[PDB]
Amino acid sequence: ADAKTVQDTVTQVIEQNMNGIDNLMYMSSNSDSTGTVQITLTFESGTDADIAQVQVQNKLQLAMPLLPQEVQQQGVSVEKSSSSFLMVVGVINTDGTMTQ
Amino acid sequence: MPNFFIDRPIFAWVIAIIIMLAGGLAILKLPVAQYPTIAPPAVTISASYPGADAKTVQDTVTQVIEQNMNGIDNLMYMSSNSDSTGTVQITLTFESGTDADIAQVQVQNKLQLAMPLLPQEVQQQGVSVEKSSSSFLMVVGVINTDGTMTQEDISDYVAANMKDAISRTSGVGDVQLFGSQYAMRIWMNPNELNKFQLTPVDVITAIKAQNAQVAAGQLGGTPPVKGQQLNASIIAQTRLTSTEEFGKILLKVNQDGSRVLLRDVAKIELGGENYDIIAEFNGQPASGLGIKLATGANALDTAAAIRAELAKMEPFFPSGLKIVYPYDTTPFVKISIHEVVKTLVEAIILVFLVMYLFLQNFRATLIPTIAVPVVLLGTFAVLAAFGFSINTLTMFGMVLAIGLLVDDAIVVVENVERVMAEEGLPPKEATRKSMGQIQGALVGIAMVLSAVFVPMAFFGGSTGAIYRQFSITIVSAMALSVLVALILTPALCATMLKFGWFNRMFEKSTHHYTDSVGGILRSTGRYLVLYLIIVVGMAYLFVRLPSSFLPDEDQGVFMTMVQLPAGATQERTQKVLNEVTHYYLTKEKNNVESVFAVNGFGFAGRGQNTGIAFVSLKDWADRPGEENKVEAITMRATRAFSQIKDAMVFAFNLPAIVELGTATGFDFELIDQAGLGHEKLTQARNQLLAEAAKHPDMLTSVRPNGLEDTPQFKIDIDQEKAQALGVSINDINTTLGAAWGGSYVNDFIDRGRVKKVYVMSEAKYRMLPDDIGDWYVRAADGQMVPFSAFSSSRWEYGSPRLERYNGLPSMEILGQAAPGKSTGEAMELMEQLASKLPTGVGYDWTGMSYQERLSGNQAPSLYAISLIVVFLCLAALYESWSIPFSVMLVVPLGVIGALLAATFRGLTNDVYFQVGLLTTIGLSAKNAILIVEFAKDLMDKEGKGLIEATLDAVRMRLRPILMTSLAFILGVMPLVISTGAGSGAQNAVGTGVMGGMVTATVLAIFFVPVFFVVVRRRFSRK
Amino acid sequence: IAQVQVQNKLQLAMPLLPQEVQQQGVSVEKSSSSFLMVVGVINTDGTMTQEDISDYVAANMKDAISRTSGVGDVQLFGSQYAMRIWMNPNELNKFQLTPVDVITAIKAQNAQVAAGQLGGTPPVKGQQLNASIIAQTRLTSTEEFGKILL
Amino acid sequence: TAAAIRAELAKMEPFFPSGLKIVYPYDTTPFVKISIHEVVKTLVEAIILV
Amino acid sequence: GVGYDWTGMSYQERLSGNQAPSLYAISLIVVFLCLAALYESWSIPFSVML
């Protein structure tokens, strides 16, 4: 999917449907130019994340049927999210027995 | 405690300020809704199978999804509909405290594993689970005023430019849409079609290819070639966005170069997604949008906030469309709450005026005007601290207890003006003696009053969540008042304490009464009977009185329910809605504000032959006559209407608890427990139904709440025949279906938005059975074949709305008590009548009926425990295994008079009365305490007379009563008793308290010292 | 929640399962491993079989026990009935048919089509008379499955 | 939970065919009842002795 | 038409600000009220709050 022809095609539909979720502070999304979408919901400090994830997941299941059959084929993942990696365990090869 | 606090004075002020400052801080949190949450959590799964029919929708979908509703926690029961509009709706009801968010997840999750087994056409339509809750904040309307726009046009604008607008505001926890939004309509024409040798399948096949959305790649991106330099996205085919891009779809290319387009085979307009609800407002096309509340947000603010947002978009409403408001639960919630607060600040003015007229001292009448507005302000914080909200229930909740928190300010500042008076000390010194006679006696009424209120918080499901509302507010208001009456009220009496038209009249009148008691009392056994006559009067009074839930109050709106007979159509339903629309705007131009009429939805299922019209009225101030209220307009209307053709049209007022259980009747499910058919069960239902009238002793209206079988047209594809022609089952079916039921091909992008594309035969090629004529499907040899070639159709009966309770198919029937008999005894007869029914048929009870069944009647069972804890509590206040019984004999005094508003007014034994009942039992036990205490005290302390003390107490206790007990009545009598504006519930509290408080005081002044002297004497006598 | 999470990750995999593995219905559960209890069903009359008594149970008593709050899992001790088409390969060869033909057959003659509706919606001019059209219907008898046309 | 299981079962007995009856082979629940009541008796009677 | 807002670190810092006025007042009112009780005198808190 192109890029507008995905934001309005999927990202609208999700956002349209994230009305009335206890302790919503703010959401922010971005459609792509490869076909990717990332809606993010942020909740009141305090507020219970596992419930937050739940209502989110609940409100989504309503957009979901309206999503392109090819998106539904992918996933639409819904999990509690951070933003910054806590670590980056890397891995190299000492004696070129292994390419990148 | 109080003694070592009337010394420490400004400390008591601090406490008082916190309570005020926190109680007031909470007034400023606190959600405000008409009612709090009181129905069990329900989760409705519901879906569409375009152009289905009850059976097909059922055995293809409903059974399937229900076969899958397993391993879900706290499910109370599971009911489901499958009607001939291609619509299935399943409602899982859950236990009282089930978190609605986990319930909905679990369902949804279990549903999402059923999905692969649902027919393809449904998977796409999309099954959807949400949490059902029929409590709407308001239903805005969007009407076009000039005649530019249609339903669908207006629908589209609303769902396009203004929906999310609201959906993103304060509070609004849900937005629904009273219309479609557009859909690329594509209305085939079997004639401009059998010509080019095309079927709808070919039409379907094209739209799919020429309106898809293909992926290509970029250039490089993924592993590129040694040092590329350009990288950018390829944009292959991507969706049509015009009616003309659609029309232009290439359908056929036949030798000679013939350009057969979609335009050439069908109209290609733009229209509604769905076409069987015709919602118009005051005659004009309409397409509103209904908003539900939130989860802790003011019905007031997130309403006053909706009207703001609606103002911002109001410039940009092009042409002549205006927003209209045919439903708001706000003008109600507001005046209902602007009162109460008034009732409260008035009952204030009272305890000041029954404080002059008895005490003269202005500094006196000024202490409870600091005590009550504190306990009030303060119990608010306790409310907000327990999740509780400001609402119709929790409101009268306090009002109904204003008499108890008054009678804690008067009572305290009494003794310091009785004691401080007669051979008395200065203020500080006298307050110390006042709280020693009342000190222990109050921290006993507290326990005694904890019971008789707590045991109310423990009731059933639905009601009993309401009861809790009442229970907690009161036990909070109550305990928090005693807490001022030991901390602040005394410390306020000292440092503040030191009548022209009464003065001497009471001086002798105390004495006239003081004698009346002692008079005839030499017999004593005089009024031990007459008590027994008043105890049994009450018992006869009780059993007699009608039971009920909530005063069916005139709200803003009400509605007429129109239902045409069997095969009646939309249009034919409209004309019946037009008379209604008219009659209201005409024979009622003075009360009716608007008639919002929906042609399509109805009570007990949809169809072109059912309607509903919502009439919202002019503001109550404009509706002055009591014949301009609603239990009046309906009655006139109901009958006024009973003169139409095939058309049942009646009007009714919606109950006060909109999202709750109707009537005081039953909800009976008739269940099918062997392979016994629909047909086989329909009989059984009739059997029982018949057997139900042959008992007019246990009411009428024992009606099935369903739909009766109707005729249907059955097209039977002969297989053998299809084989010999080049004609393939799928090609046959699809054509039929697509033409007549219409199919959802795929999606397209109109003006930046995804919207559906439907493909369905033009209206005029799909009206009559003789219209199949025109539909041809091409054989795989090459030639257009006629349906008569390979079908053969016949009429037959069938359900258009199939039902099921808890898995097995069902038929729900409901009916009312019996003008005479009790809700419970009705059920029993009905069950008994079930017993006689054919083998393989059962019965279950649901909703309110189930809601009673499992919650039983706990009143007696529960108030055993209250009573037993009142004796147990009281026997400690007094140091006695016996004396308490002199107080409990006051329970009945209140009950009569309270009940005796079976006479003076015609009312019911309802919730707003029963708590009113408890408040009365409240002060009656609290007078019985201080009197039995005062008696005992200066008879154990000053060793006074077995009977002499009884007089030098009922004397010393008289005035307080007369003061507060007056203040109460002359403040419970304003618009509370005789009203008109959100009245009902108001009248309801009043009458139980009003009279019954009469008989509570104007009858305990004699009886309690009777009670006290009759006891003692019998315990240690011989 | 533990269950909630498992299923969220599940559903990303679902579109990737075999169609047949979906068709059976994957299942997610949260229950003790050991049996809380076993309910047995007999026929004293000796009148019903192993194959009948199992089916009674499944079609008739299972679904509710399953839905009973706190019943994490239910095991059926036998199987529910099913239309059973015990193909014969000699025959199929005689008349020159693969099990494919037989399936293709059963899919077309054992269906539940939504036809449409006579009363329309978007109706015309002025129409009285409205009722639904009823097309094919799932067979309900070993007998009808038999009369299928190969 | 068993409480409910046998109660649901109750609700579907009056409709069984011919002579089809419930039998209750392996069931762990009862022991647990009998078990705690045994430890209640020898908690009551143990008060009697004291 | 064109408007603005804050997020992440910002929106939290913004809302850390605006709250402080309140935090001191409501903080002091408790301290001042705590004295008018600790010394059962309305007078000496005005003298400490100075």
Side-chain angles (χ1 to χ4, degrees):
Chain A
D2 323 321
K4 167 73 156 53
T5 31
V6 58
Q7 193 208 49
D8 60 8
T9 251
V10 55
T11 323
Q12 270 313 345
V13 201
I14 320 263
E15 300 225 358
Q16 182 186 12
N17 250 307
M18 234 80 48
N19 357 131
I21 309 297
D22 302 7
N23 317 286
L24 195 60
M25 279 202 302
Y26 63 73
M27 62 158 162
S28 74
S29 84
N30 79 289
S31 203
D32 231 2
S33 61
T34 103
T36 283
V37 193
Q38 287 221 309
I39 286 95
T40 281
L41 289 285
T42 291
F43 297 84
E44 220 82 62
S45 332
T47 189
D48 172 10
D50 273 311
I51 287 291
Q53 107 93 67
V54 147
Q55 318 192 44
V56 176
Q57 158 169 168
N58 276 158
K59 278 304 290 173
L60 173 64
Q61 285 156 298
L62 280 138
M64 275 287 222
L66 309 151
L67 281 53
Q69 174 151 62
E70 12 227 28
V71 178
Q72 286 179 49
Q73 272 295 137
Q74 234 61 50
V76 199
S77 90
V78 195
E79 73 240 46
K80 335 214 273 323
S81 85
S82 184
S83 174
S84 43
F85 319 59
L86 147 133
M87 190 186 312
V88 179
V89 48
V91 174
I92 35 81
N93 186 48
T94 124
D95 40 74
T97 325
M98 322 215 89
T99 122
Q100 128 66 66
Chain B
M1 185 177 287
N3 298 62
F4 232 4
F5 224 115
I6 77 166
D7 290 336
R8 311 174 275 144
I10 166 80
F11 185 34
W13 268 124
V14 194
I15 296 205
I17 312 167
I18 298 156
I19 295 170
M20 259 186 82
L21 209 62
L25 213 283
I27 302 268
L28 239 62
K29 176 212 177 181
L30 290 169
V32 184
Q34 195 184 32
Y35 298 104
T37 290
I38 68 92
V43 184
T44 307
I45 318 174
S46 33
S48 269
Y49 191 173
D53 54 281
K55 188 92 149 311
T56 285
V57 112
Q58 186 196 239
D59 306 342
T60 260
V61 168
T62 328
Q63 230 148 125
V64 194
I65 91 101
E66 52 190 62
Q67 215 148 128
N68 267 67
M69 293 299 114
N70 330 103
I72 299 196
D73 298 311
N74 309 50
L75 175 45
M76 211 142 97
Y77 50 76
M78 170 187 66
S79 41
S80 77
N81 287 15
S82 328
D83 49 34
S84 257
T85 60
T87 310
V88 181
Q89 159 140 168
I90 286 105
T91 314
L92 304 91
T93 310
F94 293 74
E95 283 302 321
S96 49
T98 311
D99 170 307
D101 277 335
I102 316 284
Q104 197 213 318
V105 182
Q106 302 201 141
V107 178
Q108 250 288 5
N109 269 145
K110 289 301 153 212
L111 185 273
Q112 270 302 319
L113 266 40
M115 288 291 233
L117 280 63
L118 285 161
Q120 189 66 221
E121 299 88 6
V122 174
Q123 298 194 81
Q124 67 182 344
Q125 261 309 312
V127 177
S128 63
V129 186
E130 32 189 358
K131 292 176 264 58
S132 72
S133 174
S134 292
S135 270
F136 265 90
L137 220 211
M138 67 175 103
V139 66
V140 178
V142 175
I143 75 160
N144 174 243
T145 207
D146 43 38
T148 303
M149 299 197 277
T150 65
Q151 201 140 98
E152 292 73 33
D153 313 319
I154 298 187
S155 294
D156 200 85
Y157 189 76
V158 185
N161 296 14
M162 77 182 281
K163 186 168 65 56
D164 350 67
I166 325 315
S167 319
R168 284 164 27 246
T169 61
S170 163
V172 302
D174 209 44
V175 268
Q176 226 186 274
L177 175 77
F178 275 63
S180 296
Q181 148 188 292
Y182 284 139
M184 182 59 61
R185 305 312 316 204
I186 301 178
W187 299 103
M188 296 170 264
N189 183 304
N191 287 162
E192 319 161 23
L193 198 81
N194 178 21
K195 183 166 64 208
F196 306 133
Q197 288 92 58
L198 288 180
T199 71
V201 189
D202 304 291
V203 174
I204 289 172
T205 311
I207 309 181
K208 298 277 191 62
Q210 294 171 243
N211 180 35
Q213 207 275 16
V214 175
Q218 317 146 279
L219 302 150
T222 74
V225 89
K226 51 174 278 282
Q228 194 42 41
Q229 257 276 295
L230 175 64
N231 172 237
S233 302
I234 302 174
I235 299 248
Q237 168 174 25
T238 184
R239 285 179 185 89
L240 290 51
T241 75
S242 74
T243 55
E244 301 119 83
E245 269 173 305
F246 273 104
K248 284 208 289 131
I249 300 170
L250 179 281
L251 291 177
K252 197 204 186 63
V253 82
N254 64 241
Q255 245 83 74
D256 87 333
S258 51
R259 63 171 201 274
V260 187
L261 308 174
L262 182 67
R263 186 209 313 148
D264 316 327
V265 294
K267 306 195 303 168
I268 322 283
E269 57 159 334
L270 202 74
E273 206 171 313
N274 181 69
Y275 269 116
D276 62 355
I277 277 191
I278 290 301
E280 60 192 46
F281 181 71
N282 273 163
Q284 301 148 270
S287 179
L289 176 128
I291 307 90
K292 299 179 178 191
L293 195 63
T295 290
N298 304 64
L300 296 197
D301 310 32
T302 98
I306 288 160
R307 297 180 186 265
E309 258 297 336
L310 272 255
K312 189 202 158 196
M313 308 169 288
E314 196 159 329
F316 302 127
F317 293 160
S319 191
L321 95 161
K322 29 148 58 190
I323 62 173
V324 192
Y325 286 54
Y327 188 120
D328 183 3
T329 182
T330 275
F332 189 90
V333 187
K334 207 169 283 171
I335 80 124
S336 215
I337 250 85
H338 171 88
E339 314 216 333
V340 177
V341 99
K342 172 179 163 279
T343 286
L344 230 153
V345 180
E346 272 173 3
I348 286 292
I349 272 59
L350 275 292
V351 187
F352 179 111
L353 271 56
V354 196
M355 221 83 195
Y356 252 15
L357 244 146
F358 273 93
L359 267 62
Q360 173 154 46
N361 205 154
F362 157 92
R363 260 173 198 83
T365 97
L366 188 132
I367 65 92
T369 308
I370 280 98
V372 159
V374 169
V375 169
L376 254 306
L377 217 74
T379 82
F380 274 105
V382 209
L383 277 207
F386 277 47
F388 286 54
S389 61
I390 285 174
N391 52 61
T392 296
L393 288 184
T394 209
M395 279 303 94
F396 289 96
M398 298 175 321
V399 166
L400 199 14
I402 204 177
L404 279 157
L405 42 73
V406 149
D407 189 83
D408 274 318
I410 290 196
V411 166
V412 179
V413 75
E414 182 57 24
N415 264 29
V416 215
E417 224 97 320
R418 188 141 293 186
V419 147
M420 207 213 187
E422 44 124 36
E423 268 184 288
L425 309 87
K428 26 161 195 148
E429 282 92 70
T431 308
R432 288 207 90 191
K433 200 192 183 171
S434 175
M435 265 113 292
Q437 298 142 342
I438 59 177
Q439 182 185 284
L442 278 176
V443 206
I445 80 93
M447 264 47 256
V448 151
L449 288 203
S450 272
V452 330
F453 283 122
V454 159
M456 164 149 282
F458 283 20
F459 274 112
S462 278
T463 51
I466 305 162
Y467 281 129
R468 187 156 20 210
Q469 295 300 293
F470 289 131
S471 163
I472 295 298
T473 9
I474 299 180
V475 41
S476 295
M478 189 281 297
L480 212 281
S481 203
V482 170
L483 272 291
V484 300
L486 293 173
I487 304 306
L488 178 80
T489 331
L492 222 71
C493 276
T495 59
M496 225 154 275
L497 288 174
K498 219 285 115 289
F499 199 36
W501 48 68
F502 191 51
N503 41 38
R504 274 80 180 81
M505 281 231 75
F506 205 63
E507 193 190 284
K508 84 195 181 204
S509 195
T510 309
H511 278 252
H512 190 277
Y513 152 74
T514 208
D515 298 343
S516 312
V517 181
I520 321 291
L521 190 145
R522 65 266 314 183
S523 318
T524 312
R526 45 169 184 160
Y527 310 158
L528 196 287
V529 79
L530 190 274
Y531 178 69
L532 301 173
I533 255 60
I534 213 85
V535 139
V536 186
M538 154 204 321
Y540 164 61
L541 261 292
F542 204 108
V543 171
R544 159 172 199 176
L545 178 59
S547 59
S548 148
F549 298 110
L550 284 206
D552 200 303
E553 267 157 308
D554 172 290
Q555 293 192 58
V557 323
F558 74 104
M559 38 191 275
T560 173
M561 192 293 180
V562 36
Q563 171 108 197
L564 299 277
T569 95
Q570 189 162 71
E571 186 181 330
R572 207 214 298 172
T573 310
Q574 256 306 151
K575 300 315 153 177
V576 190
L577 280 164
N578 298 331
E579 306 189 39
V580 191
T581 256
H582 212 243
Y583 161 118
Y584 280 150
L585 291 179
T586 196
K587 270 296 141 219
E588 289 267 6
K589 52 251 150 296
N590 282 294
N591 295 312
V592 169
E593 174 48 62
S594 78
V595 173
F596 209 105
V598 316
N599 182 152
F601 168 63
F603 257 83
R606 336 85 176 280
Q608 295 164 236
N609 90 310
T610 198
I612 263 310
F614 304 145
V615 37
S616 15
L617 297 171
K618 290 182 193 308
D619 184 274
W620 331 48
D622 269 76
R623 292 158 41 241
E626 196 272 343
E627 69 207 318
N628 295 19
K629 265 73 205 171
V630 155
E631 20 268 327
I633 301 179
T634 61
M635 311 275 246
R636 161 162 59 264
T638 291
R639 262 92 67 210
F641 281 111
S642 66
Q643 270 162 32
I644 321 185
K645 69 277 289 162
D646 54 270
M648 289 153 272
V649 190
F650 78 85
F652 61 157
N653 190 148
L654 54 187
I657 20 66
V658 200
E659 62 135 3
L660 189 258
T662 201
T664 327
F666 58 59
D667 207 32
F668 184 98
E669 287 287 4
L670 196 83
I671 294 185
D672 168 37
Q673 259 107 149
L676 307 183
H678 174 105
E679 291 147 290
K680 198 90 74 160
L681 171 72
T682 295
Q683 285 140 50
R685 176 206 55 164
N686 288 331
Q687 203 148 153
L688 174 80
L689 264 174
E691 275 299 287
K694 301 170 176 158
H695 291 257
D697 26 305
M698 326 273 179
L699 217 255
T700 348
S701 295
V702 195
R703 83 222 93 118
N705 182 223
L707 296 195
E708 293 292 328
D709 279 17
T710 95
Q712 41 190 71
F713 185 63
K714 158 63 141 296
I715 299 177
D716 199 329
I717 312 93
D718 182 293
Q719 295 299 72
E720 207 201 18
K721 284 179 147 82
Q723 273 181 224
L725 292 333
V727 79
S728 47
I729 278 78
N730 314 78
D731 249 39
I732 278 161
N733 285 322
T734 301
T735 300
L736 178 76
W740 297 85
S743 166
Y744 167 46
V745 160
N746 67 19
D747 293 324
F748 89 110
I749 309 186
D750 164 82
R751 303 179 272 122
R753 291 184 103 90
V754 285
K755 305 198 174 189
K756 293 188 176 84
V757 188
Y758 282 86
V759 96
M760 180 196 212
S761 137
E762 176 112 75
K764 78 181 304 166
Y765 311 95
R766 68 106 195 304
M767 299 305 263
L768 289 162
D770 314 305
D771 271 334
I772 285 153
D774 323 324
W775 295 96
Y776 287 95
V777 311
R778 180 161 37 71
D781 82 31
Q783 44 189 325
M784 302 316 278
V785 163
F787 254 78
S788 54
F790 59 71
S791 93
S792 59
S793 74
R794 310 290 201 306
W795 277 89
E796 47 145 277
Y797 269 103
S799 168
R801 199 166 133 301
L802 311 172
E803 307 177 25
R804 329 169 59 78
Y805 196 66
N806 252 65
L808 300 321
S810 89
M811 295 185 73
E812 159 180 58
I813 85 194
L814 62 221
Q816 299 167 7
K821 274 83 168 84
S822 70
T823 251
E825 75 190 337
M827 303 200 200
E828 169 150 60
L829 159 262
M830 195 97 222
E831 308 195 270
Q832 280 163 182
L833 298 184
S835 176
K836 305 157 177 159
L837 290 166
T839 47
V841 319
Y843 75 88
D844 215 316
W845 278 121
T846 198
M848 54 190 188
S849 265
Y850 167 96
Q851 179 50 221
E852 168 169 322
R853 209 71 182 160
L854 257 98
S855 288
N857 177 44
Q858 297 137 290
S861 177
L862 238 169
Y863 280 133
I865 326 310
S866 178
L867 217 294
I868 300 318
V869 161
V870 200
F871 168 31
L872 221 65
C873 225
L874 220 30
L877 165 63
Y878 318 130
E879 313 141 51
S880 91
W881 247 212
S882 58
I883 282 76
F885 224 125
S886 66
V887 184
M888 344 216 87
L889 302 175
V890 211
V891 174
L893 268 61
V895 191
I896 38 100
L899 289 175
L900 268 68
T903 306
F904 321 141
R905 190 102 77 153
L907 309 180
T908 44
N909 175 168
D910 80 41
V911 177
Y912 279 129
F913 150 81
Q914 321 184 18
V915 176
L917 202 38
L918 295 175
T919 284
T920 300
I921 313 266
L923 301 160
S924 282
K926 168 103 158 278
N927 301 332
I929 273 161
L930 303 166
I931 271 153
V932 172
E933 178 75 6
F934 267 174
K936 197 192 155 149
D937 266 337
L938 50 72
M939 183 202 277
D940 229 308
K941 269 80 141 67
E942 274 49 60
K944 294 195 183 168
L946 323 126
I947 295 179
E948 192 237 306
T950 320
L951 282 300
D952 207 309
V954 97
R955 182 201 93 72
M956 211 188 167
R957 202 85 228 112
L958 196 266
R959 183 172 68 173
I961 293 146
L962 263 299
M963 296 177 69
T964 188
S965 172
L966 181 65
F968 203 5
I969 97 92
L970 295 183
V972 90
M973 279 203 83
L975 291 187
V976 188
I977 305 289
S978 57
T979 344
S983 16
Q986 211 170 40
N987 307 306
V989 194
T991 344
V993 204
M994 225 284 281
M997 186 96 299
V998 156
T999 79
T1001 64
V1002 200
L1003 206 137
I1005 75 300
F1006 312 140
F1007 269 92
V1008 295
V1010 167
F1011 295 137
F1012 181 70
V1013 156
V1014 178
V1015 201
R1016 292 290 254 165
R1017 295 206 142 159
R1018 187 162 182 156
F1019 297 95
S1020 80
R1021 187 173 184 97
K1022 174 205 64 63
Chain C
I1 292 316
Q3 176 187 230
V4 156
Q5 261 147 48
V6 159
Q7 204 135 186
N8 195 305
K9 285 317 202 295
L10 213 266
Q11 200 53 29
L12 302 182
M14 205 68 85
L16 282 142
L17 273 351
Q19 262 272 105
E20 301 87 337
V21 175
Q22 258 131 305
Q23 215 84 10
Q24 301 302 314
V26 170
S27 101
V28 196
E29 267 156 357
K30 43 186 261 265
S31 60
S32 174
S33 214
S34 22
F35 286 124
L36 173 108
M37 106 192 299
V38 177
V39 171
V41 174
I42 274 65
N43 178 66
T44 49
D45 286 11
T47 79
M48 322 184 77
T49 49
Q50 186 281 130
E51 14 273 323
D52 286 306
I53 299 188
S54 226
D55 183 68
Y56 188 80
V57 145
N60 269 303
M61 312 172 50
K62 193 177 171 308
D63 286 12
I65 292 318
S66 285
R67 296 193 271 93
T68 301
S69 175
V71 173
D73 187 47
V74 154
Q75 280 302 136
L76 201 250
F77 283 129
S79 186
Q80 186 188 245
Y81 276 136
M83 189 51 58
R84 305 296 332 208
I85 253 96
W86 298 127
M87 326 182 74
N88 187 122
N90 306 324
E91 252 89 81
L92 276 201
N93 174 38
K94 165 162 47 191
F95 308 90
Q96 307 179 204
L97 304 166
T98 86
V100 189
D101 304 317
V102 178
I103 326 259
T104 329
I106 309 178
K107 266 132 163 283
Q109 319 193 43
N110 185 210
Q112 195 77 88
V113 196
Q117 217 179 284
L118 298 192
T121 233
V124 309
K125 201 314 167 71
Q127 166 150 313
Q128 55 188 343
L129 165 296
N130 163 214
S132 29
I133 302 146
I134 271 69
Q136 311 167 54
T137 258
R138 314 204 139 153
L139 325 198
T140 182
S141 168
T142 54
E143 148 148 52
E144 325 185 54
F145 269 101
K147 307 193 103 81
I148 307 254
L149 204 69
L150 282 169
Chain D
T1 267
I5 302 187
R6 45 204 24 165
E8 183 57 44
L9 290 192
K11 314 185 71 180
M12 59 184 102
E13 298 214 72
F15 318 90
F16 288 142
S18 80
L20 178 289
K21 94 203 283 294
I22 307 189
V23 298
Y24 297 73
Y26 186 91
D27 172 341
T28 177
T29 223
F31 161 88
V32 189
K33 260 176 293 169
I34 328 301
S35 166
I36 70 99
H37 273 222
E38 208 82 300
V39 183
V40 153
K41 298 180 83 159
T42 46
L43 184 266
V44 178
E45 81 184 33
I47 171 269
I48 274 149
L49 304 187
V50 186
Chain E
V2 173
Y4 81 109
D5 213 311
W6 302 98
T7 313
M9 283 298 287
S10 271
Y11 169 112
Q12 200 67 53
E13 157 176 270
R14 141 137 74 77
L15 283 298
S16 171
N18 319 356
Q19 270 202 331
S22 298
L23 209 202
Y24 308 116
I26 197 114
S27 201
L28 295 148
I29 305 308
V30 182
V31 195
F32 163 46
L33 278 190
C34 268
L35 296 166
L38 205 278
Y39 301 120
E40 56 227 356
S41 164
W42 199 27
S43 296
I44 90 284
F46 290 101
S47 336
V48 179
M49 295 287 86
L50 275 174

